[PDB]
RNA sequence: UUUCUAAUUUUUAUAUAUUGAAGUAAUAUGUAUUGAAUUGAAUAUUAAAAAUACAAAUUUAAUUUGUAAUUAAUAAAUCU
């Protein structure tokens, strides 16, 4: 949909910089090579595909002290981005948030072997979704017969 | 089929229902993204992201409303 999009896109301010040794231009193009690409699907069905609009340095990119548009109010410019440890969960998410396939879920815990505490929490809002998509599924079936892939598909 | 008689095979065989479950509630990533004149779970394709359960629909040019909310309903017990 058009509505509900940016039309004034900021541009990334940088506040202050993250460290006192620059990271000569010789490393940045070292490491920066490593991240234009990026994992995508997370089983046997691992997919490394590539990563458009790479930023330049990431050194600087987010790791402390630079910006983010995301100017809201009339008072609150850019805000600046505290260290990595001043924000709550932030390397307990990286266990957690990613594309979880069930697949890989259900070992983990019938084998009670859980990298992180809140990937029991990430399969059940995970299942607890599945559910609903079924307890939805049949309480339209209570008004009339849905049949799936019964009509045309594609083009 | 010698004749009188006796006899164990008979134009008599079992057929699918109880229940138009229709009240019980404002919302909140979210009108996701893309393709789209437009699309908000219900154009098209795309489908394993989430969290504080309800994306294979009806509906509308779009939405909101509004229908719907995974349940008691044991013919089996042969009938001779």
């Given at each position: 949909?058009?509505?509900?999009?940016?039309?004034?896109?900021?541009?990334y301010?940088?506040?202050?910089?993250?460290?006192?040794?620059?990271?000569?231009?010789?490393?940045?193009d070292?490491e920066?090579?490593?991240?234009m690409?990026?994992?995508?699907?997370?089983m046997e069905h691992?997919?490394?595909?590539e990563?458009?609009?790479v930023?330049?340095?990431m050194?600087?990119?987010?790791?402390?002290?630079?910006?983010?548009?995301?100017?809201?109010f009339?008072?609150?410019?850019?805000?600046?981005?505290?260290?990595?440890?001043?924000?709550?969960?932030?390397?307990?998410?990286?266990?957690?948030?990613?594309?979880?396939?069930?697949e890989?879920?259900?070992?983990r815990?019938?084998?009670?072997?859980?990298?992180?505490?809140?990937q029991?929490?990430?399969?059940?809002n995970?299942?607890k979704?599945?559910?609903?998509?079924?307890?939805?599924?049949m309480?339209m079936?209570?008004?009339?017969?849905?049949?799936i892939?019964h009509?045309?598909?594609?083009?």
């Open positions: 949909k058009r509505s509900g999009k940016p039309s004034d896109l900021p541009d301010k940088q506040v202050y910089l993250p460290y006192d040794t620059a990271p000569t231009k010789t490393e940045l070292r920066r090579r490593k991240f690409h990026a994992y995508s699907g997370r691992r997919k490394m595909v990563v458009k609009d930023p330049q340095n050194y600087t990119y987010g790791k402390e002290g630079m910006s983010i548009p995301i100017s809201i009339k008072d609150q410019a850019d805000p600046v981005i505290g260290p990595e440890w001043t924000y709550p969960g932030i390397f307990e998410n990286k266990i957690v948030a990613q594309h979880w396939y069930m890989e879920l259900f070992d815990e019938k084998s009670n072997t859980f990298e992180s505490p809140w029991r929490q990430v399969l059940d995970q299942v979704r599945r559910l609903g998509k079924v307890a939805w599924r309480s079936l209570n008004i009339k017969t849905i049949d892939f009509k045309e598909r594609g083009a």
